[PDB]
Subunit: 221 residues, 3 copies
């Protein structure tokens, strides 16, 4: 399938973006700046790793459904499993948040990725959609604590902090909305948009969120 | 098997108890109160999720043993894997504990659930019992740091704190004792009590611990 | 295979070393000393658990490669998955480190064990070596933050602290270097050194690192 030219493209970028933040953060003496550079460079590194497994083949196993065996891309749920909490912990660290607030976000996020995978590998039943919906519920709570909650706290900060968070939250809500759209439309969902294109859309939102988020946040607060 | 009318019953309650703490905690402005509401609502939510997987079928795979294939309910070990550390972290957060104390509890608890699963899915050998015993050892240490350790620290607090912890520890030790009893007696163990009843007993202790713990603790400290 | 007399030997020692730190730490009233005893006794306990699974057989599954099915010892990647971050968190706790510093070490370590396993269970392709190399990269970063980074901070402490860290870092860098050597030379890698001997080498470095590290650090700071 031509999807290899999208995995190949991704592994290239994610790996480069990792090598990029790796050399930029080599100077950070400051603790807080050192900290943000920690999360932000940890998320792209993982993306590369999984994208390699995805391309090489390890992260691809045929799963029954209906009457035919379909191309499951479970490695995506491994990337997302860690990559995601780190990105949320990132924002909450910036916009000084509560242990209750961060522990719950990452809690509902963990339900977001896990519930998602469960339905991604559901035996064969069209019960997949039910899990999709549970993930939707979860993601709705996530973008609520993010949007409305944090912004208020973003007003307790200097213009830089309120600004970076502004763009970051924007990018974060928008990108995280397109994900479940690409999922339902493609493989795991119906099959309307083929895997080739689905894998491109996901690779696009993936390179977008993780590297964009890095470049925008990394811009000195 | 009639066990579906126990999974169905559970998923109903766990999910409702989740929706309940979800609406009660919407008002918590205070940080500490916000925090406890975080753990306490995170544990029931997970229980529901897994109970759905349990009912729908995902969390049920046939495993060899002796000469016949048996009904393994591994999803229980996924629920317990997270649900448990959160409940211990809960109590230790109330009765102000040490990083050494909490990190070790959750450490021995993680050995409690993992060792448990290993023997729950042991190939076919009657080596299952050995793992059971290791879990017993682990759980003994757990109820020791809980009972004797924390109570002493419960005396350094206001009557509310010493009180809630009192009932909470009571409920926690009692319920956590019945669990390994139901395990040895049923499926994974001998087969004395059928799965139908075992699944009821587990669903009872499950709805009991998680929702009861929530209602009792949630009662303002 | 005679490798059972190495797993048996290991499970014996690891379990004993666990029982040893368990009785020594029963007196620690001090918080910090209590804390270090927490990590240090948690790592050996896990080693025993997995070594039992390794011996009994659970942690051994035949995997295709080339044309013949090979003896994969995945349980090692379960031990290492947790045992390792705990040992690094240990050193960083001693030589007062940053959240950025500890979160990144444990981050690159998690990539160390995961990437390692991925290639340990790679379908059959000689793509195993590529993952080996990624692990090498990861481990290189790890021993860099350890060696050069921490030592500088080791100079901000009393002679005891600078001393224990000295020996600990020595033992840690040396032992962690022999590991990937034993891996490439044996099973997962080429097949030069048989599993019998490989399992001995690994059991030696395992009993060495975890119990030695414990004895040396546990020596009052
Ligand atoms: C091979 C050799 C490699 C390992 C070299 C890399 C070195 C690296 C840049 C470390 C630099 O030093 C850490 C700096 C802060 O130094 P800082 O402490 O401020 O210096 C002054 C005080 O220490 C003392 O005080 P005084 O000066 O007065 O004496 O920033 C710390 C920044 C981190 C928080 C960055 C987070 C990223 C995360 C680790 C990515 C994971 C990547 C890995 C899987 C590795 C991948 C390898 C592959 C790509 C091949
Ligand atoms: C769809 C729409 C949904 C998302 C709406 C839900 C909103 C929810 C109640 C959030 C309320 O606000 C958070 C409050 C504290 O507000 P608080 O900060 O005190 O307000 C004042 C200062 O912010 C500023 O100061 P000032 O007023 O002076 O300006 O409590 C915080 C309490 C948490 C700690 C609760 C923990 C539970 C955990 C998150 C459960 C997981 C559940 C998920 C998987 C979601 C499931 C969805 C399904 C059931 C369908
Ligand atoms: C069966 C019975 C067993 C459980 C008994 C074991 C008890 C154990 C030693 C606990 C001792 O008390 C904890 C002490 C500190 O007491 P401390 O708080 O200083 O006392 C004074 C103040 O509390 C109050 O003040 P005041 O005196 O003024 O009133 O150290 C705390 C040390 C920890 C941090 C040790 C970390 C190791 C970790 C838990 C290993 C995991 C092992 C498990 C899986 C269990 C394995 C079981 C198998 C081997 C069979
Ligand atoms: C770097 C990668 C990021 C930020 C990935 C984020 C992924 C999601 C927010 C995924 C959400 C999903 C659902 C809500 C339901 C279907 C499954 C997912 C994972 C596509
Ligand atoms: C909400 C669920 C809770 C609090 C579940 C707790 C479960 C246990 C304490 C289980 C203990 C077990 C053993 C000691 C050995 C056999 C396996 C278990 C999981 C039944
Ligand atoms: C108690 C056990 C310890 C400290 C184990 C440490 C193991 C390692 C540092 C392993 C490193 C590896 C690689 C760099 C590549 C091949 C796979 C490993 C796990 C052998």
């Amino acid at each position: 399938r031509p999807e290899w030219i999208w995995l190949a493209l991704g592994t290239a970028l994610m790996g480069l973006g990792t090598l990029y933040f790796l050399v930029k953060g080599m100077g950070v003496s400051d603790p807080d700046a050192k900290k943000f550079y920690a999360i932000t460079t940890l998320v792209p590194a993982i993306a590369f790793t999984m994208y390699l497994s995805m391309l090489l083949g390890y992260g691809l196993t045929m799963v029954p459904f209906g009457g035919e065996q379909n191309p499951i891309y479970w490695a995506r749920y491994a990337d997302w499993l860690f990559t995601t909490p780190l990105l949320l912990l990132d924002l909450a660290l910036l916009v000084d948040a509560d242990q209750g607030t961060i522990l719950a976000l990452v809690g509902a996020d963990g339900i977001m990725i896990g519930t998602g995978l469960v339905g991604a590998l559901t035996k064969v039943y069209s019960y997949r959609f039910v899990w999709w919906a549970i993930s939707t519920a979860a993601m709705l709570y996530i973008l609520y604590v993010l949007f409305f909650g944090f912004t208020s706290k973003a007003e307790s900060m200097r213009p830089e902090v309120a600004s970076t968070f502004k763009v970051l939250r924007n990018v974060t809500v928008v990108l995280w909305s397109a994900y479940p759209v690409v999922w339902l439309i493609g493989s795991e969902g119906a099959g309307i948009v083929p895997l080739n294109i689905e894998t491109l859309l996901f690779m696009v939102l993936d390179v977008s969120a993780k590297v964009g988020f890095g470049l925008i946040l990394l811009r000195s607060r």
